[PDB]
């Protein structure tokens, strides 16, 4: 999931009230990779949102088609969100 | 061989040297060669996705005047692909880059998306709001859409070429 | 449990999925035969009557094969 | 496209160093190796290093050639000491996870252009 952008070493004396205690610290800077999320979560959401706009190009009188499209897009987005919440 | 999803093909035994911060050390190594079993993912993931894409393409053979039927059909096919993709990716490790099955699922999902867009484009040019009566020789009636007529060839053909390229690249 | 290879449960679920898929394809065939090839001619009821018998019988045969081969 | 550019000398009377820079893909997890091909069309394994910095060598060049890797620069170097006339050959830089291999050329999916090395006495 991550890539180590940088690592640092620092030595310092923590000045505690009793006295100065030595300390070393090894830090890593981790950057998360988005190839996971570009495919898993962003692309289906974007394409479902795009599909939701197909209702605008259907005639107003075609109530069943437009309603089914819109509400099933709502259901698909709910499914995506819920299962994403479970997996993540 | 207590392996479920792998086949232990064999072992390769070797020896080498590692130069660490404290000195050189002899390191004796073995390498167990494993190959994954593919039948599970064929039956559970690839083949339902293929049949769902085939379903999404079957919409082109319905009459253009069945607007609610084709609309529900395409959008529910998109929902089915969403469910299949979620179930498929539940059974993977959380790697960053894209696996082959991820690409297959994405391509199939794009195919069903394009099928629904194709139906929308076909419906945009539909003139009459009634289908063929059943006892007329062509009152006027809607002609069969050219978009549908050549999509029936273009979509299965493109899916077949993609399948051939995919199953030649990896196998 | 996650056992990544084919099992009897997988075969049964696959067969049932194929059956429902074929029923949907059957209606698609009926619709194409009526509205698609119909203008050119000038029986879909025959296709429906055939399906009503074949689908239950084929499913029963599939169940018999499954419940004999595995039990 | 993934490329493995190779650098180093070709003529020595002797010590030499043949470097290999990889571009197009990160080979941190892959086993980077060197192969030799003398005239007559036989490829010979020379050395290899894995992700664990573990060095494998061929018997013919054990204790003579030293293989090292720069994981930050994504490169592999082969230091050749004690060259003899029979070492004249084309040296190939290879990378790839070692499946059924680590000593077989078939296990490596990436190869370099090669570098000709000659030794004269
Ligand atoms: C991740 O995130 C963490 C945050 O938690 C980062 O950690 C911190 O890292 C930075 C560097 O990246 C540290 O800065 C340095 O500390 C050194 C220590 O030297 C000093 O220590 C002496 C005791 O041994 C002390 O007497 C001197 O004085 C100062 O230091 C004390 C600490 O004792 C402090 O209270 C004051 O700041 C005093 O002024 C002595 O300086 C310090 O030298 C560094 O400063 C230098 O940089 C310039 C340019 O090089 C140099 O010219 C100067 O001399 C200047 O002093 C710097 O302050 C910091 O201490 C870390 N903090 C903790 C809590 O750990 C980590 O780096 C991140 N890593 C990654 C990979 O993202
Ligand atoms: C019009 C549009 C056209 C579009 C074009 C569509 C074309 C359709 C492409 C299909 C590709 C199929 C995947 C091929 C991948 C190759 C996979 C393969 O080599 O076969 C075996 C795996 O499969 C398997 O046994 C599992 C087989 C499961 C079979 C289930 C029966 C389903 C019947 C329902 C009908 C199916 C066909 C429908 C296709 C449309 C290998 O394993 P093997 O044997 O060595 O060891 C036992 C095993 O458990 C471990 O591997
Ligand atoms: C896959 C490639 C698809 C290429 C599709 C491109 C195929 C193509 O170029 O055909 C034209 C198409 C519309 O064709 P379509 O068949 O739907 O429309 C017919 C015709 O165009 C007239 O509208 C009518 O004839 P006429 O006037 O009354 O005589 C006739 O009705 P009727 O006569 O029965 O009453 C209509 O049926 O419009 C686009 O370009 C779609 C945008 C591209 C959409 C791209 C979708 C992916
Ligand atoms: C009107 C019809 C309503 C039916 C609903 C109720 C079905 C309940 C059937 C009971 C199934 C059962 O318990 O079978 C167990 C035995 C094996 O016994 P054992 O020795 O292994 O313990 O046999 C087996 O090996 C398992 C076989 C399972 C048989 C499947 C029955 C198919 C039902 C058709 C539904 C239309
Ligand atoms: C952003 C895209 C949203 C979904 C798809 C909507 C467009 C599908 C219907 C096509 C309408 C465009 C028809 C152009 C023909 C013309 O020149 O009048």
XYZ file of C-alpha atoms and ligand atoms in Angstrom:
675
model
C 0.000 0.000 0.000
C 2.872 2.401 0.769
C 6.239 3.530 -0.557
C 9.014 4.847 1.698
C 9.610 8.347 0.334
C 12.322 9.148 2.884
C 13.862 7.984 6.147
C 15.609 10.153 8.741
C 17.763 9.599 11.825
C 17.927 12.112 14.681
C 19.777 11.927 18.011
C 18.692 14.217 20.839
C 18.763 14.526 24.628
C 15.251 14.780 26.050
C 15.620 17.295 28.894
C 13.471 15.624 31.531
C 13.136 17.281 34.943
C 15.399 14.756 36.681
C 17.974 15.131 33.914
C 18.756 14.799 30.235
C 18.022 11.316 28.858
C 19.547 10.223 25.518
C 17.262 9.329 22.637
C 17.542 8.182 19.041
C 14.719 8.295 16.507
C 14.324 6.581 13.132
C 11.461 8.091 11.120
C 9.930 6.916 7.837
C 7.682 8.964 5.548
C 5.203 6.612 3.856
C 3.184 7.698 0.815
C 0.109 5.642 -0.027
C -0.407 4.414 -3.589
C -3.704 5.165 -5.336
C -3.761 2.437 -7.992
C -5.926 0.484 -5.558
C -8.476 3.278 -5.212
C -8.490 4.661 -8.772
C -9.923 1.323 -9.924
C -11.791 0.019 -6.879
C -13.707 3.094 -5.679
C -13.310 6.223 -7.823
C -14.018 4.769 -11.272
C -17.302 2.942 -10.439
C -18.583 6.007 -8.584
C -17.725 8.308 -11.492
C -19.316 6.007 -14.060
C -22.486 5.509 -11.992
C -22.751 9.288 -11.644
C -22.338 9.620 -15.416
C -25.018 6.972 -15.996
C -27.368 8.933 -13.736
C -27.290 11.753 -16.324
C -28.748 9.494 -19.044
C -32.195 10.287 -17.610
C -31.942 13.836 -18.971
C -31.807 12.590 -22.581
C -34.894 10.344 -22.170
C -38.333 11.797 -22.867
C -40.175 13.220 -19.868
C -43.192 10.977 -20.502
C -41.094 7.788 -20.147
C -41.625 7.770 -16.398
C -40.838 4.095 -15.808
C -37.488 4.191 -17.616
C -36.211 7.417 -16.049
C -37.396 6.463 -12.560
C -35.885 2.983 -12.770
C -32.591 4.421 -14.012
C -32.375 7.059 -11.289
C -33.419 4.889 -8.367
C -31.255 1.960 -9.471
C -28.297 4.334 -9.734
C -29.109 5.381 -6.159
C -29.199 1.717 -5.129
C -25.908 0.968 -6.895
C -24.218 3.939 -5.238
C -25.541 2.801 -1.852
C -24.198 -0.698 -2.525
C -20.795 0.717 -3.486
C -20.623 2.892 -0.371
C -21.743 0.158 2.031
C -19.456 -2.555 0.684
C -16.560 -0.091 0.511
C -17.196 0.714 4.173
C -17.085 -3.007 4.953
C -13.876 -3.715 3.018
C -11.865 -0.631 3.968
C 1.526 -30.614 0.330
C -1.037 -28.782 2.480
C -1.802 -26.191 -0.214
C -5.336 -25.176 -1.187
C -4.875 -22.667 -4.027
C -1.284 -23.536 -5.063
C 0.462 -26.470 -6.719
C 3.956 -27.172 -5.379
C 5.827 -27.853 -8.612
C 9.212 -28.485 -7.027
C 12.191 -27.215 -5.066
C 15.500 -25.609 -6.022
C 18.323 -25.919 -3.478
C 21.258 -23.507 -3.470
C 23.866 -21.765 -1.333
C 25.267 -18.263 -1.302
C 26.913 -15.447 0.624
C 25.421 -12.362 2.288
C 27.646 -9.375 3.107
C 25.989 -7.681 6.084
C 27.122 -4.808 8.291
C 28.804 -7.281 10.682
C 30.526 -9.585 8.179
C 30.072 -12.163 5.450
C 27.782 -15.108 6.197
C 27.069 -18.352 4.370
C 23.342 -18.618 3.608
C 21.792 -21.927 2.548
C 18.588 -21.425 0.563
C 15.721 -23.415 -0.888
C 13.074 -22.104 -3.285
C 9.660 -23.766 -3.443
C 8.011 -23.143 -6.818
C 4.255 -22.562 -6.533
C 1.665 -22.070 -9.276
C -1.819 -20.813 -8.483
C -4.948 -22.780 -9.346
C -7.159 -20.805 -11.733
C -10.397 -22.824 -11.836
C -11.907 -21.110 -8.798
C -11.507 -17.661 -10.317
C -12.778 -18.927 -13.672
C -16.000 -20.297 -12.187
C -16.574 -17.576 -9.570
C -15.317 -14.337 -11.185
C -14.385 -14.470 -14.883
C -17.287 -16.525 -16.187
C -20.153 -14.749 -14.364
C -18.632 -11.467 -15.560
C -18.545 -12.811 -19.121
C -22.173 -13.929 -18.942
C -23.199 -10.566 -17.490
C -21.481 -8.792 -20.389
C -23.285 -11.159 -22.770
C -26.537 -10.187 -21.056
C -25.752 -6.479 -21.421
C -25.143 -7.098 -25.131
C -28.396 -9.060 -25.501
C -30.228 -5.735 -24.988
C -29.416 -4.787 -28.592
C -31.753 -7.521 -29.892
C -34.856 -6.136 -28.142
C -37.122 -3.741 -30.005
C -36.209 -0.089 -29.508
C -39.726 0.841 -28.350
C -39.360 -1.220 -25.135
C -37.751 1.763 -23.432
C -38.495 0.824 -19.773
C -37.467 -2.785 -20.376
C -34.082 -1.924 -21.878
C -33.472 0.857 -19.334
C -34.117 -1.452 -16.372
C -32.137 -4.178 -18.122
C -29.003 -2.095 -18.615
C -29.050 -0.408 -15.218
C -29.628 -3.708 -13.401
C -26.790 -5.224 -15.436
C -24.563 -2.396 -14.195
C -25.682 -3.183 -10.641
C -24.889 -6.870 -11.195
C -21.387 -5.999 -12.403
C -20.937 -3.785 -9.346
C -21.870 -6.696 -7.079
C -19.587 -9.101 -8.955
C -16.656 -6.670 -8.871
C -17.097 -6.115 -5.131
C -17.228 -9.855 -4.461
C -14.204 -10.455 -6.684
C -12.049 -7.839 -4.998
C -13.070 -9.026 -1.523
C -10.858 -12.069 -2.276
C -7.610 -10.213 -3.091
C -4.771 -8.780 -1.000
C -4.649 -5.010 -0.693
C -1.989 -4.342 -3.308
C -1.707 -0.948 -4.982
C -1.137 -1.650 -8.677
C -3.701 -3.382 -10.874
C -3.904 -7.157 -11.140
C -4.994 -8.918 -14.319
C -8.421 -9.790 -12.925
C -8.881 -6.143 -11.940
C -8.271 -5.158 -15.567
C -10.723 -7.820 -16.756
C -13.393 -6.571 -14.348
C -12.779 -2.945 -15.331
C -13.044 -3.755 -19.040
C -16.285 -5.694 -18.546
C -17.696 -2.862 -16.429
C -16.807 -0.383 -19.172
C -18.520 -2.690 -21.668
C -21.817 -2.711 -19.764
C -21.537 1.068 -19.305
C -21.077 1.501 -23.054
C -24.014 -0.834 -23.723
C -26.298 1.345 -21.604
C -24.973 4.472 -23.343
C -25.652 2.757 -26.676
C -29.253 2.132 -25.654
C -29.595 5.780 -24.633
C -28.304 6.902 -28.032
C -30.687 4.504 -29.795
C -33.631 5.788 -27.754
C -32.753 9.416 -28.513
C -33.570 8.861 -32.209
C -36.731 6.786 -31.687
C -39.667 8.605 -33.293
C -42.882 6.699 -32.542
C -43.866 5.647 -29.038
C -45.500 2.374 -30.118
C -44.038 -0.913 -31.312
C -44.953 -2.976 -34.362
C -48.621 -3.945 -34.285
C -47.961 -7.512 -35.489
C -50.334 -7.493 -38.492
C -48.959 -4.748 -40.757
C -46.612 -4.678 -43.742
C -44.711 -1.561 -42.570
C -49.702 3.910 -40.041
C -45.907 4.119 -39.974
C -43.609 2.166 -37.662
C -40.123 2.736 -36.304
C -37.338 1.238 -38.375
C -34.707 -0.935 -36.730
C -31.967 1.378 -35.499
C -28.733 1.351 -37.473
C -26.959 1.881 -34.144
C -28.441 -1.352 -32.784
C -27.886 -3.160 -36.085
C -24.129 -2.547 -36.141
C -23.737 -2.638 -32.346
C -24.908 -6.261 -32.452
C -21.712 -6.909 -34.444
C -19.327 -4.375 -32.896
C -19.878 -5.165 -29.214
C -19.555 -8.997 -29.226
C -16.672 -8.716 -31.689
C -14.800 -6.230 -29.504
C -15.450 -8.351 -26.418
C -14.150 -11.434 -28.225
C -10.971 -9.681 -29.357
C -10.429 -8.412 -25.814
C -10.960 -11.932 -24.462
C -8.472 -13.401 -26.938
C -5.848 -10.756 -26.145
C -6.381 -11.175 -22.394
C -6.220 -14.978 -22.407
C -3.174 -14.955 -24.704
C -1.272 -12.328 -22.704
C -1.388 -14.157 -19.359
C -1.771 -17.878 -20.123
C -14.790 -20.886 4.224
C -12.445 -19.826 1.427
C -11.230 -22.916 -0.439
C -10.005 -21.611 -3.817
C -10.856 -24.531 -6.064
C -14.021 -25.940 -7.596
C -16.431 -27.731 -5.243
C -19.904 -29.234 -5.557
C -21.531 -26.081 -4.162
C -19.806 -24.067 -6.890
C -21.150 -26.415 -9.564
C -24.709 -26.187 -8.225
C -24.672 -22.392 -7.958
C -23.142 -22.158 -11.432
C -25.827 -24.416 -12.885
C -28.641 -22.402 -11.326
C -27.074 -19.151 -12.548
C -26.829 -20.604 -16.057
C -30.489 -21.627 -15.881
C -31.744 -18.154 -14.950
C -29.426 -16.625 -17.566
C -30.875 -18.962 -20.191
C -34.432 -18.036 -19.179
C -33.638 -14.353 -19.695
C -31.970 -15.179 -23.021
C -35.089 -17.174 -23.918
C -37.281 -14.115 -23.517
C -34.774 -12.062 -25.518
C -35.032 -14.652 -28.295
C -38.840 -14.481 -28.180
C -38.798 -10.684 -28.421
C -36.368 -10.712 -31.347
C -38.387 -13.375 -33.171
C -41.568 -11.327 -32.814
C -40.387 -7.772 -33.466
C -37.171 -8.517 -35.360
C -38.044 -11.195 -37.912
C -41.804 -10.519 -37.828
C -41.868 -7.582 -40.277
C -39.894 -9.627 -42.813
C -42.330 -12.596 -42.725
C -45.449 -10.522 -43.571
C -44.415 -18.880 -33.588
C -43.417 -17.181 -30.341
C -46.203 -19.013 -28.502
C -44.576 -22.251 -29.661
C -41.263 -21.104 -28.166
C -42.922 -20.247 -24.848
C -44.770 -23.578 -24.756
C -41.498 -25.378 -25.494
C -39.698 -23.477 -22.731
C -42.402 -24.161 -20.126
C -41.732 -27.901 -20.472
C -38.010 -27.953 -21.252
C -36.771 -25.676 -18.461
C -38.367 -27.599 -15.539
C -37.412 -30.937 -17.105
C -33.818 -29.891 -17.787
C -33.502 -28.491 -14.263
C -34.859 -31.742 -12.816
C -32.343 -33.707 -14.892
C -29.543 -31.432 -13.674
C -30.665 -31.945 -10.075
C -30.763 -35.720 -10.560
C -27.256 -35.762 -12.039
C -25.936 -33.535 -9.243
C -27.569 -35.525 -6.433
C -26.442 -38.877 -7.886
C -22.869 -37.992 -8.873
C -21.993 -36.440 -5.485
C -24.135 -38.337 -2.961
C 9.312 0.037 -22.220
C 11.690 -1.647 -19.756
C 15.385 -1.354 -20.649
C 18.606 -2.597 -19.035
C 21.455 -0.438 -20.296
C 24.928 -1.894 -19.761
C 28.184 0.027 -19.376
C 31.822 -0.928 -18.979
C 35.053 -1.487 -20.827
C 35.744 -4.042 -23.527
C 39.553 -4.227 -23.745
C 41.991 -5.052 -20.944
C 45.551 -6.387 -20.902
C 43.637 -6.759 -15.220
C 40.502 -5.501 -13.467
C 37.157 -4.311 -14.833
C 33.687 -3.253 -13.676
C 30.516 -3.838 -15.710
C 27.523 -1.781 -14.572
C 23.859 -2.194 -15.467
C 21.229 0.512 -15.020
C 17.565 -0.497 -15.183
C 14.844 1.846 -16.424
C 11.114 1.476 -16.938
C 10.413 -0.609 -13.829
C 11.568 -0.911 -10.219
C 13.501 -4.145 -9.627
C 13.659 -4.027 -5.823
C 11.893 -7.397 -5.459
C 13.482 -9.039 -8.526
C 16.656 -11.122 -8.698
C 19.265 -9.255 -10.753
C 21.855 -11.488 -12.404
C 24.718 -11.571 -14.885
C 25.169 -14.150 -17.641
C 28.116 -14.824 -19.947
C 28.048 -16.040 -23.556
C 31.282 -17.120 -25.205
C 31.449 -17.896 -28.943
C 29.619 -21.136 -29.716
C 26.188 -20.138 -28.338
C 26.155 -21.249 -24.699
C 24.852 -18.920 -21.980
C 26.603 -19.291 -18.616
C 25.325 -18.093 -15.257
C 27.860 -15.896 -13.445
C 26.292 -14.183 -10.431
C 22.971 -13.091 -8.979
C 21.649 -10.990 -6.104
C 18.167 -11.160 -4.589
C 16.114 -8.729 -2.495
C 17.931 -9.992 0.611
C 21.381 -8.962 -0.705
C 22.249 -12.674 -0.951
C 24.905 -13.369 -3.574
C 24.804 -16.559 -5.640
C 27.751 -17.376 -7.906
C 28.710 -19.894 -10.536
C 31.441 -22.390 -9.754
C 33.626 -21.187 -12.634
C 33.775 -17.613 -11.267
C 33.441 -18.204 -7.526
C 35.612 -15.876 -5.455
C 36.711 -13.911 -8.551
C 33.697 -11.854 -9.661
C 31.684 -9.829 -7.136
C 28.053 -8.798 -7.680
C 26.500 -5.804 -5.924
C 23.261 -3.840 -6.235
C 22.221 -0.220 -5.750
C 18.536 -0.494 -4.882
C 18.097 3.284 -4.686
C 19.530 3.691 -8.196
C 17.963 0.376 -9.329
C 21.253 -0.886 -10.781
C 23.471 -3.966 -10.531
C 27.276 -3.964 -10.812
C 29.707 -6.813 -11.488
C 33.348 -6.334 -10.490
C 35.659 -8.638 -12.462
C 39.115 -9.315 -11.006
C 41.714 -11.739 -12.293
C 40.712 -11.776 -15.955
C 42.175 -14.479 -18.208
C 41.989 -14.828 -22.015
C 39.178 -17.409 -21.880
C 36.913 -14.835 -20.174
C 36.492 -13.054 -23.527
C 32.738 -13.124 -24.086
C 29.530 -11.084 -24.214
C 28.118 -10.273 -20.767
C 24.344 -9.902 -20.358
C 22.479 -8.173 -17.539
C 19.223 -9.910 -16.587
C 16.379 -9.409 -14.136
C 13.255 -11.305 -13.150
C 11.878 -13.375 -10.306
C 13.551 -16.762 -10.297
C 10.857 -19.359 -10.974
C 12.188 -22.904 -11.527
C 15.540 -21.120 -11.889
C 17.993 -18.658 -10.304
C 20.630 -20.442 -12.453
C 18.667 -20.783 -15.736
C 18.242 -18.058 -18.344
C 14.592 -19.033 -18.889
C 13.596 -17.676 -15.455
C 14.538 -14.070 -16.370
C 12.023 -11.992 -18.342
C 14.309 -8.945 -18.804
C 17.671 -8.838 -20.579
C 20.209 -6.200 -21.550
C 21.790 -5.486 -24.910
C 25.067 -7.005 -23.711
C 28.680 -5.883 -23.464
C 31.603 -7.424 -25.336
C 34.697 -7.976 -23.186
C 38.019 -9.096 -24.676
C 41.311 -10.013 -22.992
C 44.657 -10.136 -24.816
C 47.932 -11.656 -23.606
C 8.841 12.766 10.633
O 8.292 13.693 11.570
C 9.105 13.877 12.738
C 8.331 14.773 13.674
O 8.048 14.115 14.902
C 10.454 14.459 12.333
O 11.272 14.592 13.490
C 12.032 15.669 13.983
O 13.004 15.638 12.942
C 13.724 16.870 12.791
C 14.630 16.704 11.593
O 13.922 16.191 10.472
C 14.485 17.185 14.074
O 15.125 18.449 13.939
C 16.391 18.393 14.588
O 17.052 18.153 15.809
C 18.476 18.291 15.733
C 19.057 17.888 17.075
O 20.311 18.537 17.233
C 20.306 19.192 18.527
O 20.300 18.342 19.651
C 21.095 18.752 20.777
C 20.888 17.711 21.860
O 21.458 16.487 21.410
C 20.639 20.151 21.207
O 21.387 20.567 22.341
C 20.825 21.173 20.064
O 19.695 22.042 19.999
C 18.266 22.245 19.758
O 17.767 20.945 19.893
C 16.858 20.750 20.985
C 16.662 19.254 21.153
O 17.533 18.803 22.185
C 15.549 21.485 20.672
O 14.788 21.625 21.863
C 15.820 22.881 20.053
O 15.419 22.900 18.686
C 17.278 23.337 20.217
O 17.401 24.513 19.414
C 21.099 20.511 18.704
O 20.709 21.480 17.728
C 18.801 19.744 15.360
O 20.205 19.890 15.220
C 18.104 20.130 14.045
O 18.341 21.502 13.758
C 19.109 21.845 12.612
O 19.034 22.061 11.225
C 19.901 23.084 10.685
C 20.139 22.738 9.231
O 20.765 21.460 9.180
C 21.200 23.140 11.497
O 22.100 24.045 10.879
C 20.893 23.617 12.921
O 21.959 23.268 13.799
C 19.547 23.079 13.422
O 19.758 22.745 14.796
C 16.611 19.825 14.089
O 16.030 20.761 14.983
C 13.531 17.211 15.261
O 14.266 17.360 16.470
C 12.720 15.921 15.320
N 11.748 15.982 16.402
C 11.391 14.919 17.130
C 10.376 15.171 18.202
O 11.865 13.805 16.932
C 11.130 13.549 11.318
O 12.325 14.159 10.846
C 10.201 13.276 10.139
N 10.805 12.317 9.227
C 10.346 12.098 7.992
C 11.083 11.070 7.190
O 9.378 12.702 7.542
C -21.014 -13.654 -27.818
C -19.892 -13.007 -27.007
C -18.607 -13.826 -27.178
C -17.559 -13.411 -26.135
C -16.485 -14.508 -26.036
C -16.740 -15.351 -24.789
C -15.693 -16.467 -24.706
C -15.664 -17.088 -23.309
C -14.236 -17.180 -22.747
C -13.981 -18.089 -21.820
C -12.570 -18.224 -21.218
C -12.594 -19.362 -20.179
C -11.393 -19.281 -19.220
C -10.219 -20.097 -19.792
C -9.007 -19.955 -18.855
C -8.122 -21.213 -18.893
C -8.359 -22.054 -17.636
C -7.950 -23.518 -17.888
O -6.903 -23.757 -18.376
O -8.829 -24.575 -17.546
C -8.774 -25.100 -16.228
C -9.522 -24.196 -15.242
O -10.897 -24.089 -15.611
C -11.736 -25.051 -15.006
O -11.390 -26.191 -14.931
C -13.114 -24.626 -14.444
C -14.195 -24.983 -15.470
C -15.573 -24.613 -14.928
C -16.635 -25.083 -15.936
C -18.046 -24.721 -15.425
C -19.085 -25.144 -16.489
C -19.889 -23.891 -16.930
C -20.878 -24.261 -18.050
C -21.554 -22.966 -18.556
C -21.073 -22.605 -19.980
C -19.597 -22.156 -19.931
C -19.143 -21.529 -21.263
C -19.800 -20.160 -21.491
C -18.764 -19.169 -22.034
C -19.491 -17.962 -22.643
C -7.341 -25.282 -15.738
O -7.375 -26.061 -14.571
P -6.995 -27.663 -14.642
O -8.031 -28.392 -15.451
O -5.639 -27.832 -15.294
O -6.964 -28.289 -13.097
C -8.133 -28.236 -12.295
C -8.441 -26.794 -11.853
O -9.249 -26.829 -10.717
C -7.153 -26.031 -11.525
O -6.727 -25.313 -12.650
C -20.563 1.339 -31.843
C -20.575 2.396 -32.946
C -21.966 3.016 -33.041
C -22.017 4.018 -34.193
C -23.421 4.613 -34.241
C -23.564 5.531 -35.459
C -24.549 4.967 -36.488
C -25.045 6.102 -37.380
O -24.266 6.872 -37.835
O -26.414 6.221 -37.667
C -26.997 7.460 -37.366
C -27.433 7.491 -35.903
C -28.955 7.406 -35.805
O -29.426 6.305 -36.531
P -30.919 5.701 -36.180
O -31.068 4.320 -36.770
O -31.080 5.601 -34.683
O -32.064 6.734 -36.764
C -32.804 6.447 -37.926
C -32.583 7.577 -38.940
O -31.402 8.261 -38.600
C -33.734 8.587 -38.967
O -33.822 9.213 -37.709
C -35.077 7.927 -39.303
O -35.156 7.759 -40.697
P -35.938 8.905 -41.585
O -35.278 10.246 -41.369
O -37.381 8.977 -41.150
O -35.872 8.537 -43.047
C -35.262 6.553 -38.645
O -36.561 6.484 -38.114
P -37.789 5.980 -39.086
O -37.430 6.241 -40.529
O -38.017 4.503 -38.886
O -39.047 6.735 -38.734
C -34.272 6.287 -37.507
O -34.460 4.968 -37.057
O -26.999 8.688 -35.320
C -25.705 8.623 -34.793
O -24.780 8.880 -35.487
C -25.499 8.208 -33.336
C -24.365 9.001 -32.678
C -23.157 8.107 -32.377
C -23.438 7.275 -31.125
C -22.281 6.327 -30.819
C -22.785 5.231 -29.881
C -21.610 4.392 -29.383
C -42.416 -30.260 -1.449
C -40.899 -30.396 -1.319
C -40.421 -29.632 -0.085
C -38.985 -30.046 0.230
C -38.406 -29.149 1.327
C -37.785 -29.998 2.442
C -36.529 -30.714 1.943
C -35.867 -31.440 3.114
C -35.246 -32.727 2.570
C -34.317 -33.373 3.603
C -32.901 -33.473 3.036
C -32.050 -34.369 3.940
O -32.000 -34.163 5.105
O -31.344 -35.433 3.349
C -30.305 -36.003 4.098
C -29.917 -37.326 3.431
C -28.534 -37.778 3.899
O -28.662 -38.327 5.182
P -27.307 -38.608 6.079
O -27.154 -40.092 6.314
O -26.093 -38.087 5.347
O -27.439 -37.904 7.407
O -29.973 -37.199 2.031
C -28.939 -36.503 1.378
O -27.950 -37.074 1.062
C -29.092 -35.017 1.028
C -30.028 -34.904 -0.180
C -30.796 -33.575 -0.207
C -32.081 -33.769 -1.013
C -32.520 -32.462 -1.679
C -34.050 -32.431 -1.767
C -34.514 -31.597 -2.959
C -35.817 -30.886 -2.598
C -36.523 -30.427 -3.872
C -37.154 -29.053 -3.651
C -38.175 -28.775 -4.750
C -22.069 12.881 -20.589
C -22.866 11.803 -21.318
C -24.137 11.486 -20.527
C -24.897 10.254 -21.045
C -25.092 10.167 -22.568
C -25.994 11.286 -23.095
C -25.931 11.351 -24.621
C -26.636 10.158 -25.269
C -27.675 10.624 -26.293
C -27.007 11.273 -27.510
C -27.527 12.699 -27.695
C -26.744 13.438 -28.784
C -27.392 13.236 -30.152
C -26.685 14.117 -31.183
C -27.418 14.069 -32.524
C -27.623 15.485 -33.056
O -26.722 16.036 -33.740
O -28.694 16.101 -32.813
